[PDB]
């Protein structure tokens, strides 16, 4: 069975190696935190970043070290997708902006970035912002396919598919090597100096044995997932709150731990991170989305999840135990 908590245990072990005695100083103001943050980060060696953290905002005598420091990590990844940076765009979900190149300096902005989001891995701090499962897997240095494309270009994806589903650039290797090439189509530098930023704090090879949700759980922490607001903002599509199978769906929830429930909500809306209002403001690719469970096929059908519309295919299960043990396996699947 695969175990989040004994890997991220095993993955602070590996981290004490790296782990540096004493503390660095990270002045920095408010009002220009983004361009102070990145003086400050460059000016450090990877060696010093690997100290404890004592950021500091002039002014504020804050003796809340800890509290000041994931308030900076908070604020900063905030900051990665600002516009008049043209670094990260909105695609929570980040991608590098390709017109990023304007600024003739934008590899060291990248090398910053990547050493921050390393920073927040190594220091078990959490960032308010993301990236798509596809980069997840870029960080993790996994290999990167088809399937990967229909939650970043649907289109693309379609394409690549009729390929596929059917019958001149040098048919199993050509989609695997275009849906690799679109995933980091124009980007390939930014990508590269990221990477160069992010190796130097914290070897991606440290991080070997998490699969891409687990990488962005340990990114975004585990936060308590309130199932009373789960459950009023659930709809249901050929079911209703008074089905069997939905009946077992909440009690299976209520059942099982806090790590499976963000397995379960990454499985059905492709992320573990939640709206700040909530269940309510959950958003699909085509607008408003709320966690949607809908009957597909018979008691012999697997589980099945349509991520852009945030939709659970639940077949109409014999058992609770059947429902615990179908669910249980589909949302593990890597
Ligand atoms: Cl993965």
Same mark, same amino acid.
């Given at each position: 069975v695969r175990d989040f908590k004994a890997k991220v245990q095993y993955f602070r072990f590996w981290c004490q190696q790296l782990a540096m005695p004493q503390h660095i100083k990270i002045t920095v103001t408010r009002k220009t935190l983004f361009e102070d943050s990145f003086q400050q980060i460059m000016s450090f060696s990877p060696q010093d970043l690997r100290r404890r953290l004592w950021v500091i905002f002039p002014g504020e005598e804050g003796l809340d070290y800890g509290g000041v420091a994931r308030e900076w990590f908070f604020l900063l990844s905030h900051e990665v997708s600002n516009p008049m940076y043209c670094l990260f765009e909105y695609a929570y979900c980040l991608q590098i902006n &390709?017109?990023? !190149?304007?600024? &003739? /300096?934008?590899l060291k902005y990248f090398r910053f970035i990547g050493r921050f989001i390393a920073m927040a891995l190594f220091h078990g701090k959490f960032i308010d912002t993301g990236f798509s499962l596809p980069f997840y897997k870029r960080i993790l240095n996994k290999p990167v396919g088809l399937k990967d494309l229909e939650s970043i270009d649907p289109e693309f994806y379609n394409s690549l598919i009729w390929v596929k589903e059917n019958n001149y650039f040098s048919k199993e290797e050509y989609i695997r090597m275009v849906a690799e090439w679109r995933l980091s189509r124009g980007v390939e530098e930014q990508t590269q100096a990221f990477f160069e930023g992010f190796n130097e704090i914290? &070897?991606?090879? !440290?991080?070997? !044995? $998490? /699969?891409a949700k687990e990488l962005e759980v340990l990114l975004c922490g585990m936060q308590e997932i309130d199932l009373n607001d789960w459950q009023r903002h659930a709809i249901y599509r050929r079911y209703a709150r008074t089905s069997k199978q939905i009946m077992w769906f909440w009690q299976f929830v209520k059942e099982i731990d806090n790590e499976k429930r963000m397995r379960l909500l990454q499985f059905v809306t492709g992320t573990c991170r939640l709206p700040? =209002? =909530? $269940?309510? /403001?959950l958003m699909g690719s085509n607008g408003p989305q709320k966690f949607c469970i809908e009957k597909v096929g018979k008691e012999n059908w697997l589980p099945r999840s349509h991520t852009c519309f945030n939709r659970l295919d639940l077949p109409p299960y014999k058992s609770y135990e059947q429902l615990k043990e179908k669910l249980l396996f589909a949302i593990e699947e890597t």
């Open positions: &390709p017109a990023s !190149y304007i600024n &003739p /300096d934008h914290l &070897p991606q090879q !440290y991080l070997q !044995y $998490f /699969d700040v =209002g =909530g $269940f309510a /403001d």
